[PDB]
Paper text:
MRV is a prototypical member of the Reoviridae family of segmented double-stranded RNA (dsRNA) viruses, which is further divided into two subfamilies based on the presence or absence of turrets on the inner capsids: turreted (Spinareovirinae, including MRV) and nonturreted (Sedoreovirinae, including bluetongue virus (BTV) and the life-threatening rotavirus). MRV capsids are composed of two concentric protein layers, encapsulating 10 dsRNA segments. The inner layer consists of proteins λ1, σ2, and turret protein λ223.
Inside the particle, reconstructions of virion and core particles clearly show that the layered RNA genome and densities of TEC (at red arrows) are underneath the inner shell, indicating that genome replication from ssRNA to dsRNA has been completed in the core. All genome-filled core particles have the turret attached at the fivefold axis. Thus, RNA genome may facilitate turret attachment. Five λ2 subunits form a pentameric turret at each of the fivefold axes, serving as the mRNA exit channel. The λ2 pentameric turret changes conformation during virus assembly: in the core, the turret is open, with a central channel 75 Å in diameter; in the virion, it closes, sealing off the channel. In the open conformation, the Ig-like domains of λ2 straighten, forming the channel for mRNA capping and export. Unlike the core observed in this study with an open turret, the crystal structure of the MRV core, which was obtained on samples generated from chymotrypsin-digested virions, shows the turret in the same closed conformation as that in the virion. Our structural data align with these functional findings: in the core, the open conformation of the turret maximally facilitates mRNA export efficiency, while in the virion, the closed conformation of the turret suppresses transcription, leading to a virion in the quiescent state. Due to the limited number of particles, we were unable to obtain an asymmetric reconstruction of the core with TEC resolved inside.
Numbering used by the authors:
A (entry chain Q): 2 to 418
B (entry chain A): 217 to 377
C (entry chain H): 242 to 1275
D (entry chain I): 737 to 834
E (entry chain I): 492 to 589
């Protein structure tokens, strides 16, 4: 179980403010004035069947980052030491209730008065605000989404996911529930688990918690290439027909060909992508979201201070003195890792590998060009309108395009088995 | 809806919570008392007496006797008896002493007068404020729960008397 | 109507299937092709060999909107948007809303345009809420493709569907425009290219195909599928929820094997149930005739489920236990058997007292006034004694929060002339009727503290007050429901918790035998002892024999010791029955906390809010003023409740587990809750859609983006907003096939400041608020996406943007008026223009002096130059302006720019080789302008030729300020080229997935450009009923 | 050049909110409704009422308090304009004391 | 706005200008003419009210009240109710608003 409820806000990208403005905020709240957007997010990415795109939200990672920016900017009003909610405005917006249900447009007298000036990289505690401390169910319901936001905002790279292997997790009820998900895609399972988590918070060792941990382990082990049709994990695995494409689909399948031998004991790690490609990959974002929704009911091992930037260190329940390190990979090289592991196992030929690599190279070319063009447009806009100063996507640098530690994380995930 | 009480020092049979029923105490001639208010009042009087009678070489069964409110604060208003009794409980635990003798066998009229004083007009001057989160001790308070007890008490270096 | 809506509501139709094409735009041939010409031999064209072509073969082709023109559906939403070609008049689309005062059939009010477009866009969304169905494929037996798999459409005449749906399958023997385009495409992207074959010998779960479609409706149906997928649940979770709901008296099974994919959308969020509950509560307020049948239904079900039955003789026999002599005139037992008066048909009044426990937040159960003494109570009479006894037993069962004071005053009214106690004033005195004491303010101060009652003057009342204060029943709570599927609708209490005024204790034994340790018997014991005290009185006795004092105390001991199973049943079996029944109720429980004697906490008001006031945008500030109170009291019979309390009987041999297992089994086969959940989701969607659509035409407190502010709209008022909201409601109800009420509670008010919240307040001034969170809505987001796309693609919808210039232009050139040269246009910043506004005044000319009109600067100018007009100035002075200016526009050198913003248009084509003049059309348009309406703007456009033609004069009179020709497809689609007139080739950007070989197959280009060839996902999910997969053990 | 009115006037504006207590007439209606809520709230001026009726009176008063009538708006803005337009043309010109 | 074209001349005659004292004298005469006879003043008020009814865009719909309440009585057995009492006293069924 978890005893501390700390979270971290977004940091400025060299700008003078939070990188969100009025236009983007009105775009987010066009169909619902709740800052807790995690359900509406799920309706926009459309189960991951295609490349979602908007004029103001070019990608899925763009919307995820903009939700983070809005929460980080707006939650600083009720968390001031005086703990007042309806007295001032943040970018024409005010809070509806002491219980933070939604946002409305400020009344004229507050519009006349100036706005709150937020700060970068703040760390807050949920127990400080009295209305959160009073109601535990409300605190957990919002802390799920705050945990997801912290997981995005902890470092400069993409979202962080958690992988665990343990034999004693399995039980009768877990088997009974897992059989129902045969033939479903990863996105559908993620949707249903997120809705179930929203309705009722999970026990420490409930059926749903162990279920979602097993699902994450299956997805990541299939993603690396350790587990396939001919080498299963108690007959269960994930299958992709079109590896390397812009919008991959993974399907949960059952097979009786083989069962891989599993060493006893409990093992786990934290993994994350570093290349900007994660902005267009929905499975990784959903994996991080599932970890966030899990984090409310359970307590995860601490992350080492040496794998995180300076400002994000020594957070009470998140980072620690000698915790686990972060395993970072970038997408294009992992496809080569997948193909190599399959070819060594003997289930794949050289020509098939050639075709997969060619398709993945085309995909990476397209993605890199689009992201660079959008970055250029944002720079131009920031120069033209100094009173707006916004960002549509999380910033990145060129050095993030190269590979790094990919082989190490691949080896570690294969060594989890 | 009624509050939930707890002992952190040495609970009788282990960790436990007390939930009050919606009965009342009418024995006091001019005032009506809920069960939770009655428990807080009796315990705080006990701790005040134990503070005043304390001797350095004389051990006591428990170092803290006052109750703590753990749940149900939002149902209690700032003009009420429960909230003020919580403030007084925190004061007594910190080491404060009442400026009036407490008899070794209480009577109804004495309790009536005491409650009337508590509910008398005025404001709270001491810098100690209740929190359901934890029990806060001053920097220089002569208490010694913190060394011997691990759960529920937190000492603040900036909250000083 | 309201109570029928309360009992059961129409189930909306969510899941519907489409087996056609996912497209809503259509290419049509405005002008015929010139195939039998005299430069090219007819053998060139592929039309003479009868090759079916993917596109129309014509000199001009254009794109129009036609929702579901290629679809094949199993349910009809019946909200189609059908558009005629631009060579026809389309004004009827724009004159459907608020054009009820327009006289002409050919005109529409411009200030209503923004209202008509928005509703139109809503319709466009509502017709496209469908799921794409997987039909079947075949492999190509011809070399036209590389063995591709081609899809089959149900219905007649598929041989044209095959040519339409796969443009790239056509051969290329020619150098026409179509052949060049289709030769420029790639050849491996036709047909199916994904397949989720999970089980051998069954339907594949879904497929991904390349086919003709547009990106906009694909996006809409993707969002719809995503919503329905988040709503999904599986049989195992249903089994667990049903097992939890029955507390273990029902077992159902689920299968355990790999099975086909199903779609059972039933899980919703808690906020949706909150909002539905609030809407229903404001729907029911202050009406007893609405809620009484609900309690009647629940009482009947309680009798159906429960083992207890009422046997009146259990009292009668005990009453015959003692004999009284035939030498007396008054008898106690006769009084009991007369005043109790059972007939066993009043059992309902007992059950209705239990159902009321579930609804004390909106309904209050009070004892009818006639149960009290007719002229007041006197302790000397026996009837009045036993009436007090009946009331003192009956009162605790009610939910009326002022029952204790009513009992105390019922006794105090008996002692007038015997004992006295102080009161607060002269109006509410000791002789006041006890029913009058109905509010916390009427509680006397002697009742609070016992020092105000003399122990020497009124010892009986002292004892009665002590008994009431320390021996009244204690409230309790129980657990119920299964929130993992059904969620909960508890507003003020926590979910999963049901509150009771009576303490509950579970049973340890399934074969019970009589026990008196229950709280109800303990109360009756106090009551009988207190009766004995004042009967034994020597002050009461003088008119009575001593044997009568003895016989009174004897009969008080007969009823003290009656074999009553009612009290033990309520303490142990009844709470379980309530917890089992509650989750199946169509109106879920709604409660406020029970308080025993704590007067500082009795609830005094329950209020819902639906709108806000002035300059207040935050609900927490306006809820305290804008709310409306809710609640009614209900009247019960005291004698029925007392008889049921005294005379309860179990069946001779009862084993509780078997009884409840047999009783509860049938009722769990009913699935009305699964319909109620879908009803809740539709209600929330409709509310959010209403808010988003209303925000466009008027100012509101929510933050929403505004794309259509370039369309003229009127100064809306409260009436206009209500009139728009009624149309929104009608469309929403028609699409989802609902015949009962929707959004109508909101519409009895001003819809421009809507909000939903509830509160209740205590006697001491403390108030508690509930403000549900808006869950978001997919219909509103899809409508806003439609608005974003419309912002760029307005031309396909029949709307032109900008202004027009009226002026004579004559030449032989062949440019199009929808894209004129820049030198014919002028604007406000042009040097030499005159700009007019409100105060134009014409002064006539004399003796050959030219007439003049007044500028804004104050200068007066003659009728020749470049003028700028707003439309309203011509509208409000139509006849005068025509008669003054038409001659000078026709022959003179006057050119006028009319600012219109958005307008419809009509196209007229002509043969360029002959003389053409457009004056008649423009004169008709000018003369048909009225103060409140205008007709479609007429344009004259030349036809394109593929070979040499000679030139001829032409006169034009209307041109557009900017490019408005986006609805044009290719011209001369069958000839190698176009020689004269406007020239256009097939738009490459629409087919980017085929023309650009390095693009990913799933790319889209919204909102800028709508693609016309896409990748579509088609499903084959099963939608069975819940009874089919979940089976109970008989 | 002056015409006297017993009510205040404001510039005409068709979009004025219905629930606005800056208008004198709507405010007057609200004050009267709240006073009656005070009158009936405690049931001390109504002995002889056998069963409680406070919730029903409060509900009816709230319904009458928030009603969506345009008449106060019309009397504040358009009626003075109509009177001023008609006045110069009357056969019997106005005769007013203050 | 009103306009009136004309050609220049000096033999035109349009005699209509007078003073304020003459109008005041005529008004005083008209005031004395009434002489407490109500039959003199009844037509003036009646016709002005009908003209106002014609010109004004405001229109009176009593149904707005009946929908706000939304109560129906089953029979005379619903003896006492505030909403029905107020609706019965207000009488929406009558449409004379003179």
């Amino acid at each position: 179980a978890r005893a501390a409820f700390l979270f971290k806000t977004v940091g400025f990208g060299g700008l003078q403010n939070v990188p969100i403005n009025d236009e983007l905020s009105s775009h987010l709240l066009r169909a619902g004035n709740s800052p807790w957007q995690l359900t509406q997010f799920l309706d926009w990415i459309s189960l991951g069947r295609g490349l979602a795109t908007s004029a103001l939200v070019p990608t899925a990672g763009s919307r995820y980052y903009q939700m983070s920016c809005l929460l980080s900017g707006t939650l600083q009003i009720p968390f001031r030491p005086n703990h007042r909610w309806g007295d001032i405005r943040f970018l024409r917006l005010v809070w509806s209730a002491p219980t933070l249900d939604g946002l409305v447009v400020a009344p004229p007298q507050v519009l006349a008065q100036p706005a709150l000036q937020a700060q970068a990289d703040r760390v807050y505690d949920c127990d400080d605000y009295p209305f959160l401390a009073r109601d535990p169910r409300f605190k957990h319901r919002v802390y799920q989404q705050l945990s997801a936001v912290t997981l995005l905002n902890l470092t400069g790279f993409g979202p962080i996911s958690y992988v665990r292997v343990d034999e004693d997790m399995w039980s009768g009820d877990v088997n009974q529930l897992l059989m129902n998900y045969f033939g479903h895609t990863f996105a559908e399972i993620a949707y249903t688990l997120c809705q179930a988590s929203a309705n009722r918070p999970w026990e420490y060792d409930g059926t749903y918690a162990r279920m979602t941990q097993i699902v994450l382990s299956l997805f990541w082990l299939s993603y690396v290439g350790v587990i396939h049709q001919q080498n299963t994990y108690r007959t269960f695995y994930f299958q992709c027909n079109r590896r390397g494409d812009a919008a991959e689909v993974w399907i949960l399948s059952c097979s009786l060909n083989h069962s891989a031998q599993i060493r006893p004991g409990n093992r786990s790690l934290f993994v994350m992508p570093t290349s900007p490609d994660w902005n267009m990959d929905v499975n990784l974002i959903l994996s991080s979201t599932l970890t966030g929704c899990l984090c409310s009911g359970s307590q995860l091992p601490l992350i080492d201070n040496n794998s995180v930037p300076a400002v994000s260190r020594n957070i009470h329940g998140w980072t620690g003195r000698a915790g686990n390190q972060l395993h970072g990979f970038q997408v294009r090289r992992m496809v080569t890792e997948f193909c190599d592991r399959l070819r060594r196992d003997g289930v794949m030929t050289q020509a098939q590998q050639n075709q997969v690599e060619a398709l993945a190279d085309q995909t990476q070319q397209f993605k890199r060009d689009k992201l660079e063009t959008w970055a250029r447009e944002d720079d131009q806009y920031n120069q033209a309108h100094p009173n707006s100063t916004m960002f549509r996507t999380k910033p990145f640098t060129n050095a993030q395009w190269g590979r790094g530690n990919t082989g190490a994380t691949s080896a570690a995930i294969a060594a989890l088995i | 809806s009624a509050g939930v009480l707890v002992h952190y020092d040495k609970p009788t049979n282990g960790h436990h919570y007390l939930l009050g029923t919606l009965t009342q105490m009418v024995s006091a001639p001019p005032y009506i008392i809920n069960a939770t208010d009655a428990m807080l009042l009796e315990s705080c009087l006990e701790q005040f007496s134990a503070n005043v009678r304390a001797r350095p070489a004389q051990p006591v069964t428990r170092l803290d006797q006052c109750y703590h409110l753990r749940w149900g604060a939002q149902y209690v208003g700032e003009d009420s008896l429960t909230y003020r009794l919580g403030v007084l409980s925190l004061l007594a635990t910190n080491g404060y002493q009442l400026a009036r003798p407490i008899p070794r066998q209480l009577t109804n009229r004495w309790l009536s007068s005491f409650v009337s004083q508590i509910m008398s007009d005025g404001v709270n001057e001491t810098p100690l404020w209740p929190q359901e989160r934890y029990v806060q001790i001053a920097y220089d308070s002569p208490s010694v729960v913190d060394g011997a007890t691990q759960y529920g008490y937190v000492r603040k270096n900036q909250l000083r008397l | 109507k309201k109570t029928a809506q309360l009992l059961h509501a129409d189930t909306p139709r969510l899941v519907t299937w489409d087996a056609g094409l996912c497209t809503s735009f259509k290419i049509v041939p405005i002008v015929p092709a010139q195939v039998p010409q005299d430069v090219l031999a007819y053998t060139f064209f592929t039309s003479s060999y009868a090759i079916q072509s993917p596109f129309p073969e014509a000199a001009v082709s254009r794109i129009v909107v036609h929702t579901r023109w290629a679809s094949n559906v199993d349910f009809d939403r019946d909200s189609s948007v059908i558009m005629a070609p631009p060579t026809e008049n389309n004004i009827h689309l724009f004159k459907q809303l608020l054009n009820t005062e327009t006289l002409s059939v050919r005109g529409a009010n411009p200030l209503m345009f923004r209202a008509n477009v928005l509703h139109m866009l809503l319709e466009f969304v509502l017709d496209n809420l469908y799921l794409n169905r997987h039909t079947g494929f075949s492999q190509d037996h011809t070399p036209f493709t590389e063995g591709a798999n081609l899809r089959s459409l149900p219905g007649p005449d598929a041989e044209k569907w095959y040519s339409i749906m796969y443009p790239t399958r056509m051969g290329t023997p020619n150098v026409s425009k179509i052949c060049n385009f289709v030769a420029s495409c790639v050849r491996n992207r036709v047909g199916r290219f994904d397949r989720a074959q999970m089980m051998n010998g069954a339907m594949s779960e879904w497929v991904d195909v390349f086919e003709t479609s547009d990106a906009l409706t694909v996006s809409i149906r993707g969002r719809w599928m995503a919503r329905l997928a988040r709503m999904n649940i599986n049989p195992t979770e249903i089994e667990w929820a049903l097992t939890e709901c029955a507390q273990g008296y029902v077992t159902v099974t689920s299968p355990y094997a790999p099975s086909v994919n199903r779609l059972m959308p039933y899980r919703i969020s808690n906020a949706e149930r909150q909002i539905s509950q609030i809407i229903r509560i404001m729907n029911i307020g202050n009406n007893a005739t609405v809620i009484q049948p609900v309690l009647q239904d629940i009482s009947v079900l309680l009798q159906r489920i429960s083992p207890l039955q009422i046997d009146p003789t259990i009292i009668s026999n005990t009453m015959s236990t003692v004999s009284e002599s035939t030498t007396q005139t008054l008898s106690p037992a006769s009084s009991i058997l007369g005043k109790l008066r059972p007939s066993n048909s009043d059992f309902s009044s007992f059950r209705v007292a239990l159902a009321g426990w579930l609804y004390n937040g909106v309904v209050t159960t009070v004892i009818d006034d006639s149960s009290y003494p007719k002229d007041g109570g006197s302790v000397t009479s026996l009837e009045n004694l036993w009436d007090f006894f009946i009331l003192a037993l009956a009162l605790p069962l009610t939910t009326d929060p002022c029952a204790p004071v009513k009992a105390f005053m019922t006794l105090a009214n008996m002692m007038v002339g015997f004992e006295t106690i102080p009161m607060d004033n002269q109006i509410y005195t000791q002789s006041r009727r006890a029913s009058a004491f109905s509010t916390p303010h009427t509680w006397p101060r002697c009742f609070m503290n016992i020092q105000l009652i003399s122990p020497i003057d009124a010892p009986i009342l002292r004892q009665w007050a002590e008994i009431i204060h320390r021996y009244w029943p204690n409230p309790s709570q129980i657990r119920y429901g299964a929130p993992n599927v059904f969620g909960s609708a508890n507003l003020f209490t926590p979910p999963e918790v049901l509150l009771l005024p009576i303490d509950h204790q579970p049973a340890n034994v399934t074969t019970p035998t009589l026990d008196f340790t229950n709280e109800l018997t303990n109360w009756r014991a106090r009551v009988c002892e207190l009766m004995k005290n004042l009967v034994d009185n020597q002050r009461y006795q003088p008119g009575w024999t001593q044997s009568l004092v003895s016989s009174m105390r004897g009969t008080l001991d007969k009823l003290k010791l009656i074999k009553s199973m009612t009290p033990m049943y309520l303490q142990q079996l009844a709470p379980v029955e309530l917890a089992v029944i509650a989750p199946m109720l169509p109106f879920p429980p709604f409660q406020v906390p029970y308080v025993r004697l704590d007067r500082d906490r009795v609830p005094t008001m329950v209020g819902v809010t639906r709108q806000s006031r002035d300059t207040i945008t935050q609900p927490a500030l306006s809820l305290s003023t804008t709310n409306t109170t809710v609640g009614v009291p209900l009247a019960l019979d005291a004698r029925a409740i007392t008889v049921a309390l005294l005379s309860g009987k179990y069946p001779p041999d009862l084993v509780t587990n078997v009884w409840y297992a047999d009783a509860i089994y049938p009722m769990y086969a009913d699935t009305e809750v699964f319909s109620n959940l879908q009803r809740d989701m539709i209600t929330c969607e409709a509310v959010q859609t209403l808010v988003t659509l209303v925000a466009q035409i008027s100012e509101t407190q929510y933050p929403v983006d505004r794309y259509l502010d370039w369309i003229p709209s009127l100064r809306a008022s409260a009436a206009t907003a209500a009139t728009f909201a009624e149309w929104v409601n009608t469309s929403m109800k028609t699409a989802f096939d609902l015949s009962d009420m929707l959004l109508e509670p909101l519409l009895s008010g001003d819809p421009r400041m809507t909000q939903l919240a509830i509160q209740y307040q205590q006697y001491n001034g403390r108030t508690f608020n509930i403000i549900p969170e808006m869950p978001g809505s997919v219909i509103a987001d899809c409508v806003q996406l439609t608005a974003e796309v419309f912002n760029h693609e307005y031309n396909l919808f029949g709307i032109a943007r900008g202004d027009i210039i009226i002026g004579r232009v004559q030449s032989t050139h062949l440019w199009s008026p929808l894209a004129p040269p820049p030198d014919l246009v002028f604007d406000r910043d042009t040097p030499g223009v005159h700009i007019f506004g409100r105060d134009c005044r014409i002064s006539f000319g004399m003796n050959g002096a030219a007439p003049m009109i007044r500028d804004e600067t104050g200068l007066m100018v003659p009728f020749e130059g470049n003028w700028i007009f707003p439309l309203a100035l011509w509208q409000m002075n139509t006849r005068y302006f025509n008669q003054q200016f038409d001659a000078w526009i026709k022959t003179g050198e006057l050119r006028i720019r009319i600012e219109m913003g958005a307008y419809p248009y009509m196209l007229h084509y002509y043969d360029p080789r002959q003389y053409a003049n457009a004056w008649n059309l423009t004169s008709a348009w000018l003369e048909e302008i009225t103060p409140t309406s205008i007709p479609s703007v007429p344009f004259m456009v030349p036809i394109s030729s593929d070979h040499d033609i000679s030139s001829a004069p032409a006169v034009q009179y209307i041109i557009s300020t900017e490019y408005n020709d986006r609805s044009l497809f290719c011209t001369n689609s069958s000839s190698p080229q176009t020689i004269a007139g406007p020239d256009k080739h097939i738009p490459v950007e629409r087919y980017n997935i085929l023309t650009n070989p390095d693009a990913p197959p799933t790319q889209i280009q919204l909102p800028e450009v709508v693609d016309l060839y896409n990748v579509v996902t088609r499903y084959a999910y099963e939608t069975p009923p819940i009874t089919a997969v979940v089976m109970g053990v008989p």
